[PDB]
Every structure is written in C-alpha cells, then in structure tokens.
Ligand binder design. Structure first.
Ligand SMILES: CNC(=O)c1cc(Oc2ccc(NC(=O)Nc3ccc(Cl)c(C(F)(F)F)c3)cc2)ccn1
Ligand SMILES: CNC(=O)c1cc(Oc2ccc(NC(=O)Nc3ccc(Cl)c(C(F)(F)F)c3)cc2)ccn1
Ligand SMILES: [Cl-]
Lengths: 264, 264
C-alpha cells in the first residue's frame, strides 16, 4: 500500500545517534517513534537507492520480533519511521552495563532472536549484519531485530562474520548460513557475556586468522550453568564450513526443545 | 505488497473463542500467533466481503498500540493471522478478575489506547466498536486495540454507544466522535473500576434513556486519586452532543500533559 507520511506530521525530538551515513532521533508520531534520516540535503544517487532498499525490506516485515516499520517520508529530507524501543541493545546489556541475566532469560532471548531470523529468512531476507548490537531488548522483555547501524550504508563487524565472508567468495558470500554464523556469535555472547577474541588486539590478524580457520571462538568460556544442548547448538552454528551450518527452522526447534526441559 | 500465507504453513492449535460469525484459535506460524476463521465452509457473498474489509483495514495499520496483522489466508478456508497477545482484555481485568491497577497504570493504559485511536483515525479508520473488551493488555503492559468480537459480522455493546448511535440517525451514525464517546466510557471504567448504569437492570430502559439524554455515566464515582484534568477529559468525551466531543489528537495531548505532572 502507501506508507508515506505527510510532512509536518513527524515531530523530531532528541538526537539518539549519529553515524557516517544517517542520523537517528527519538520522535513523535502517534506516540513515541524513532526517525532515521540521511541529514545530507543532497540525495546521492546511491543514497536514494539504499533508502529504497531499507524501506522495501522493512515494509515486507510484520513480526513481533522484528523492529516495527511505521512508515517512510520522502518529504523534506528522506527518513524512516519505526516504533520506539525502550531499553538497550543486547550488546549494551552484555558488554557495557554488564547485566546478569538468568539462564532461562538468556535461552529466551536466543529463542526470540531465532524466531525473528527464521521469519526474515522465510521472507527471503538476509540480514548480513546480525549482531548483539542489532538485537534490542524492548522493555527488557521481547527481542527486536533490526539494523541500528549508521556507520555502514569502510566499517565492519568482523566478530560476527563467517569465514567465507571474511575471505571473499564470488560477489555474494552471504547466505542463510552466513546469518546462522552471526547468530552463533550472538549465542557466544549470551553464554559467555563477552565478545570473541578479546585477547587479540589486532583487527587484521583476527580477519586473516578467522578467514583461514586458524582462529575460532573459545567455547570453553560458556557459563557453567549453560545447558549442553545449547553449547552444542552454538558449535554447530559456528562451523567454519558454510554447508555444515543448520538453518533457523532447525535452530529454533533445538532451542524450544531444551527450553521446555529447563525450568526444573 | 502480498501477505497471503501459503496453506499448510499455519498450525491451528487450541480454540480460544467461538462466535456467531467466525472462530479464533491460538496457532503457530513463526512463533505464537492467533488465527480467526469463518469455519463456515460456504463463503457467503457477504462473508467474503467482510473478510476483505477486515484484512483491508488491518494491512493499513502499523502501530505498537494496534493488534499486529501478520497475514491472511484465502487457502482452504478464509482466515486472518495476527500476533498472539499474552494476557487479558481490559474488560476482563476490570470486571471479571477485578484487578486493582495503580492510578499511574490506569492513566498509562488510557494514554496508550488514545495513542492507538489517534493512529486509526489518522488513517481515516473508524473503529465503531471500541470497548474495554477490545482493549488488550499485552503482558499486563502495552495496549493492543483490535476487534476481538465474534458475535457480529443482534448482540450489541450498548454501554459504549454514543447517544446518536443508540438512537438511529441517518444510515451511518458512526464517526470519529462516536469512537471518542466509547473511549469516554473506557476512561469511566479505568477511573471507577465499574461498568456504567450498574444500578439499572433493563437494557431497553438504558437504551431508551441514554438515547434521549435522560441517562449518562455517573462521574461522581471516579477514584478519589483521579486527577482533575482526567475527570474533565472524560466528561468532554462523553458529551451527549456529537460535535462537542474532542478528537483524539487533542485527547492524546491532554493525557500526555497531565501525565508529565503526575509521578511526584
Ligand atoms: C532507545 N532505543 C532506541 O535507540 C531505538 C532506536 C531505533 O532506531 C532505529 C530506527 C530505524 C532502524 N532501521 C532498521 O531497523 N532497518 C532494517 C534494515 C534491514 C533489515 Cl534486513 C531490517 C530487518 F532486519 F529488521 F528486517 C531492518 C533501526 C533503529 C528504533 C527503536 N528504538
Ligand atoms: C490470549 N488472548 C487471545 O485470545 C488473543 C486473541 C487474538 O485473536 C484475534 C484474532 C484476530 C483479530 N482481528 C481483529 O482485531 N481486527 C480488526 C478489525 C477492524 C479494526 Cl478497525 C481493527 C483495528 F481496530 F485493530 F484496527 C481490527 C482479533 C483477535 C489475538 C491476540 N491474542
Ligand atoms: Cl504492510
């Protein structure tokens, strides 16, 4: 249908984040919302293109686990409007304010992210940049997946990139499996409360080594209370070999299963 | 775009409610969802019409306060898929399990409903049957407006009907103001914790009296801690005269205002 918002309706408020490509403010439009605009008064032939891509992807999503797209606005300056999530990203909770979730909560956050990814993939959508920083814990309950990045469109989230992606296969190294790998790195964070390769201070080395298979997440750092089914589900997602990685439908069941026999 | 869900994908589970026109089951489709289907194997020339109306209205909505429409399914038996709300309706909380919310919570529930209605009206959509029974408290936190009715397409929620509607003005008595009136009756419930005219046991009398202006909600039953701005905002929404009733954009501001100066 038509998701364009007539100009003069949105009420841009406080600034939330500024990046190499686009800014994000907390706005007002039938309640709290979030606005993301280029800010660059000159719509680059490529910028206007990306805009159409993001919007074209968001309007194809309707799932409680995917950031809600409210509408776009081509009017005075390009902008995308999405629901306003109250809370912090999973990244922020884990490595910044170091929140200690319960094993049941962690497993739950994993199930929801999986549910979300399973949905995106079903709609034939590849995230390409799934990471704890793009997993939002709305109301400290209920995951919201999206792309909260502003640096990209140079930058790069190397820690969540599968080996075939870190290297460079024919044009598009991305695939449902590449996302599963990133998801594997997210499970690593939920289970260890830490980012991968924390003891290596050289990006180029991590890039090189991970790409050749020399380096891999240290699974012996998972919390003691971490179920075996989980630690295994993790190792399967991080498999260095693209094809050996499971798809989300199976990942979901695996989680939901170990979830049932957990409370006790 | 396209929202049709390929048959064989939805997994209808437990039955939640059965009505004169349609049934509602708790299903599975990329996580918990709700399915509403006619069940009548014979798509009435009017039933198929209503189906197109509901779906055409839901696909026009994208707001955290409006039930999320996941998709429809014309395949083997018409059906509508929406997110699954965990919790109980505002009606259930107030008059069935008699939950005692705090004044801050009540005011919050009012703000969210208002936010939702403000959105629907902006999209030029008239609810026509807004009532506590159609206000869902997702996780006892976060309002979700929708049409959880199954009786209609006889029955009638008289308590929330504006006078011009209870009577019988020309063809369509409904309007943005008629919804504001219902919203006024919802505020009455949040503020009194009771349904209107509880001391009158005759539907026909209530109908007649309310329609002539003889009867009106007893505002002197609002909780003692109920802000004046609220009790006033209520009385303005319940005005017997359609035109004297405010529209949601103004109702929202009014609430959000008295909301800021409340905590302390
Ligand atoms: C206090 N907390 C806030 O800072 C806050 C900030 C917000 O800012 C944002 C505003 C808009 C977006 N845009 C994306 O999300 N786009 C997207 C692109 C590709 C793909 Cl593939 C997808 C996908 F995966 F969802 F489908 C989504 C992201 C964040 C929103 C809510 N809350
Ligand atoms: C645990 N509690 C559950 O029972 C439960 C049951 C559910 O069942 C439902 C399934 C489908 C719907 N369909 C509508 O809502 N349609 C609608 C029509 C006109 C208009 Cl105007 C609107 C409006 F107002 F939203 F825009 C909405 C409603 C409820 C969903 C979630 N949870
Ligand atoms: Cl849509």
């Amino acid at each position: 249908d038509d998701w364009e918002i007539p100009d003069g309706q949105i009420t841009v408020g406080q600034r939330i984040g500024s990046g190499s490509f686009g800014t994000v403010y907390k706005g007002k439009w039938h309640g709290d919302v979030a606005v993301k605009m280029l800010n660059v008064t000159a719509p680059t032939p490529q910028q206007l293109q990306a805009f159409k891509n993001e919007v074209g992807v968001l309007r194809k999503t309707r799932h409680v686990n995917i950031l809600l797209f409210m509408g776009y606005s081509t009017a005075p300056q390009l902008a995308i409007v999405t629901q306003w999530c109250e809370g912090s990203s999973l990244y922020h909770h884990l490595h910044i304010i170091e929140t200690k979730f319960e094993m049941i909560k962690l497993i739950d956050i994993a199930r929801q992210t999986a549910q979300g990814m399973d949905y995106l993939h079903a709609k034939s959508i590849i995230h390409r940049d799934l990471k704890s920083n793009n997993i939002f814990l709305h109301e400290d309950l209920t995951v919201k997946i999206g792309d909260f990045g502003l640096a990209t469109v140079l930058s790069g989230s190397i820690l969540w990139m599968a080996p075939e992606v870190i290297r460079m296969q024919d044009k598009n190294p991305y695939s449902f499996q590449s996302d599963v790998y990133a998801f594997g790195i997210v499970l690593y964070e939920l289970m260890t409360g830490q980012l991968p390769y924390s003891n290596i201070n050289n990006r180029d080395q991590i890039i090189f080594m991970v790409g050749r298979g020399y380096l891999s997440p240290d699974l012996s750092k998972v919390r003691s209370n971490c179920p075996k089914a989980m630690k295994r589900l993790m190792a399967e997602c991080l498999k260095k070999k693209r094809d050996e990685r499971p798809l989300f439908p199976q990942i979901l069941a695996s989680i939901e299963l170990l979830a049932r026999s957990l409370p006790k």
